[model samples]
Target: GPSPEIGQIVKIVKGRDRDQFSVIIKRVDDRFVYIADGDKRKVDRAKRKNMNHLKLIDHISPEVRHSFEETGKVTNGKLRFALKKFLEEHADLLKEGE
Candidate 1:
């Protein structure tokens, strides 16, 4: 099975957060991962979701990777920016009647 590492982007495919995007903050385990989006997933209350519950995307945020690797911290605004940028770049993927 495939899994996303910290700083990687993931789309929620299950539960209340379905269809939303988030970044992997921490790998709680092989099956569970901590995700945060700042807006929906606050830093203090990051969501712990199963790997199977998410769909990892190919896109990654350089700023996020840098901060996570260098300072070991990430701001909520950064997460939102990353997702917004991804959505803009992949507009066709998000627009549809499906």
Candidate 2:
């Protein structure tokens, strides 16, 4: 229900990546958002998803935002790091995947 923004982390509530956490790489429109986890969905292969399918987390990665803001791009390593940090700090957010 939260507004989407680049560098913001999101959870995939639907599709093949259900329950997986990812970072918003781009905003295609009000209806679609692009995301990737760096490992599977690399920066070059962002997944285009419907807004309704993503649950936006309140956290945004300064590392990611700053990079994009300053240089207009985020490296794949940064995406991986952002996701890793989110998981390490918010491990409880991980689904049981049962």
Candidate 3:
């Protein structure tokens, strides 16, 4: 699938921790998923075990990707200024501790 939504609950269907549930805290791409375990620990790896490997338990509706896109385009200080401006415009997506 495409990028998994941040804050979505998912189950680990592969690797040593198969069948364990984790929160999808980040998405690397269609091929990878980043999970935050219940204890707040993080794990990242490729998506395997078919679509059933990852079940979307819930979505927290955070603007994680948008915030990342806003700040990720910086090529130089001037571009960084523009990126900052974009982030400021979407300040709700730039919460601390995110």
Candidate 4:
């Protein structure tokens, strides 16, 4: 119902990046957001995809958020770890065929 917060992880539900996970690096507008996986999409060049194309994951990484709060920095390692944790637990939930 609302735009995702910075550091919030999201699933690409539609488009070329479908089924991949990403973290919100920037909020472009109410209708658009920027995301990066740190591997394919780095924070330096995050993807500006539509909000409607993303599905919010249940958890947000405290490491990334706290870093943002303290040093105002985000690392590719943090992004990778967060998405890896999410994938390890819920990859099944996003699978198409059982």
lDDT at residue 92 of model 1 (Cα atoms)? 88
Question: Which lDDT tens digits does candidate 1 get at residues 6-33?
Answer: 7788889996889888888888777998
Better of 2 and 4 by lDDT: 2
lDDT of 3 by residue, 24-62 (tens): 545666556655452424333323333446666443323
TM-score of each: 0.85, 0.86, 0.42, 0.79
Clashing pairs in 1: none
lDDT of 4 by residue, 1-98 (tens): 76587788888998677987789877777788888888988888777888889998777877777877888778988899988887778778767754
Error of 4 at 34 (Å): 1.1
Q: lDDT score of model 1? A: 0.85
**Residue 91, model 1, lDDT:** 90
Clashing pairs in 2: none
Using TM-score as the measure, name the better of candidate 2 and candidate 4. 2
Candidate 2 C-alpha lDDT tens digits along 1-98: 45799999998999788988899988887689999888888888888999899898988999998988899888899999998888788677566645
Minimum summed lDDT over a 10-residue window in model 2 is located at: 89-98
* Candidate rank order under TM-score: 2, 1, 4, 3
Model 1 spans with C-alpha error above 4 angstroms: 96-98
Models sorted by lDDT, best on top? 2, 1, 4, 3
